[PDB]
Amino acid sequence: GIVEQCCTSICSLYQLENYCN
């Protein structure tokens, strides 16, 4: 899932801000 991908990698700035609500 996205949490797994953001964890086990250098999470990109946009992948990170995609979480923002």
Add this chain to the structure above:
Amino acid sequence: FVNQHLCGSHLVEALYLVCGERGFFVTPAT
């Protein structure tokens, strides 16, 4: 924003620095 893998406290700090005071939800950790 910083670099490195974010798994751990770094993710919360990342979300705080990028989304701000709104954007994610953290339960009271105790």
